[PDB]
Symmetry: C2
Subunit: 323 residues, 2 copies
């Protein structure tokens, strides 16, 4: 970083900020699980994850769930953060669409419950375990809903590798569409009812009002991460997959104006969420209300986590003005 100090715009959110009472114990347990997995090969990356307190994100985004549910979700978050850093955005696989695409089938077969992972397949061994643990506390329909979100997330990583390979910044329209699936947020939304020990009916899950609120929550989390992860992403492939970079490139903005435009889109998405929620509230069933409250806790908890996590704050210059 060179140039005058950047102002990080606020990310206003009226949703309740809560945290699971089991945060400390489960964060430590889940980190131990990750450290034992060999999903991360470097002691530096493992320690970076320990300092990042991934279980604090789990606890803030799922504040109501029992301890066993929090531990399962926290393990899933650790899998995602590790996969993101070690595989998806790694130099080996992340710059070749063909290579990443051809590497997925064995992992997809593990996800389907069709294939035993090899002893050397750290991500496969962990994914098999998580599939079995989710299956113990979820209906076939809930498991397939989760599995579907994971497959789309995996396929979306090929699109990222494609952009890296051709050295292009994706266009705003392409980026905002694919950003809903490149971040695996839907895989976490898929575990809200499972974690809470309830089951949304197909008609509730797929209701246009519920899908709209899910999509807006997913936009907010994607764009909020883009704003706060911008500095650390600058060190890796020019922060290519980041709404700040995408808007700065395709609307020819200064970095400071791109940051403000991302905050404007956040404020617009919050307003859209509140408008649709008012309509949903007229019919919403008990499970639907719990799920939507789940989305609100996720959006707000994510912001609280990201403003304080060693994963993001360290890369911002000392003179950065935080909101």
């Amino acid at each position: 970083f060179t140039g005058r100090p950047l102002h990080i715009p606020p990310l206003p959110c009226p949703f309740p900020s809560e945290i699971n009472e089991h945060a400390d114990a489960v964060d430590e347990e889940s980190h131990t699980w990750l450290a034992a997995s060999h999903m991360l090969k470097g002691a530096d990356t493992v320690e970076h994850f320990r300092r990042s307190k991934i279980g604090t994100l789990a606890a803030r985004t799922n504040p109501t769930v029992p301890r066993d549910s929090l531990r399962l979700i926290n393990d899933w978050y650790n899998w995602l953060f590790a996969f993101d850093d070690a595989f998806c955005e790694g130099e080996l696989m992340g710059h070749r669409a063909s290579a990443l695409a051809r590497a997925l089938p064995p992992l997809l077969e593990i996800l389907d419950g069709r294939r035993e992972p090899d002893g050397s397949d750290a991500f496969g061994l962990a994914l098999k375990e998580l599939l079995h643990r989710i299956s113990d506390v979820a209906s076939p329909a809930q498991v397939d809903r989760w599995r579907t979100t994971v497959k789309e997330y995996l396929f979306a990583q090929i699109w990222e590798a494609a952009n890296r390979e051709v050295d292009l910044i994706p266009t705003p329209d392409d980026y905002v569409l694919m950003r809903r699936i490149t971040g695996a947020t839907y895989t976490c939304f898929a575990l809200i009812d499972v974690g809470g020990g309830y089951r949304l009916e197909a008609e509730e899950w797929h209701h246009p009002d519920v899908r709209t609120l899910s999509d807006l929550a997913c936009d907010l989390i994607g764009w909020d991460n883009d704003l706060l992860s911008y500095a650390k992403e600058r060190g890796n492939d020019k922060a290519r997959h980041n709404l700040v970079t995408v808007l700065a490139t395709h609307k020819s903005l200064t970095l400071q104006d791109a940051l403000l435009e991302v905050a404007q889109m956040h404020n617009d998405a919050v307003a859209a969420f509140l408008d649709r929620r008012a309509a949903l509230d007229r019919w919403a069933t008990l499970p639907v209300r719990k799920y939507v409250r789940g989305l609100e806790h996720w959006v707000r908890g994510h912001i609280a986590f990201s403003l304080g996590s060693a994963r993001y704050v360290g890369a911002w210059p000392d003179d950065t003005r935080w909101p």
Copy 2:
């Protein structure tokens, strides 16, 4: 190909072979719709499609559905066949994973219903129309089920492009997995209840017995297509995405022995279907029985169509021995 006449092995199954009474009328209507769409730019491809009688595949795979259901499904089949030939396998774009991957977002945005297609985007305009027509006769959960199968099918085309790019024949284990989604069969199974005017409940649809029968049927349709489409596929990228090529390459088989091994895998999958169907019979509700009869009609109808279609038969050498009934 081989310097010795090939025999194509039979693909038997104990499923009823039926045809929708509206076959002739709907095939012609759906072909007219395809012609008007401009998804195909070459007169030669359009005429090849007319001769292929794609509506007879729709009619054989969906023999029970009312005329409006058959027309919607036939239009969808025409979309898939056109997309397969003109976009997925027809262009140099299909030889670079990064190019195909970057082409998909506009189409995904149309599928999600959040983008008006460009006036010149033939595939986009037709997909938007089909999404709306399916939405008129399907619950939101049924529409999302179909949408999910289409997205996986589209993503599966990048995997094919990846194999073309590095010029490798995929391994049997990778190929048999990805073949379930490269051929869009699940997108057609997704319209069985919709077409029939009924709705499988979530825990019926997602029941392990129903998923297993759907997966075995999907395997059968993929492998049966691979057997009969082998000859025409030699004319485009050395039949790379074909179980015959995959087994011949990776199991060091003659072409003749590879054809026989595909037929053996067909028979094994039919036997597995009958084994699992016996378990499903013990609990199956009427909607589940109609859906499973749907899978049976699809497998049998697809074979009946493929043995006779101008799409496949013409590429086989004159001395090829075709199977008995």
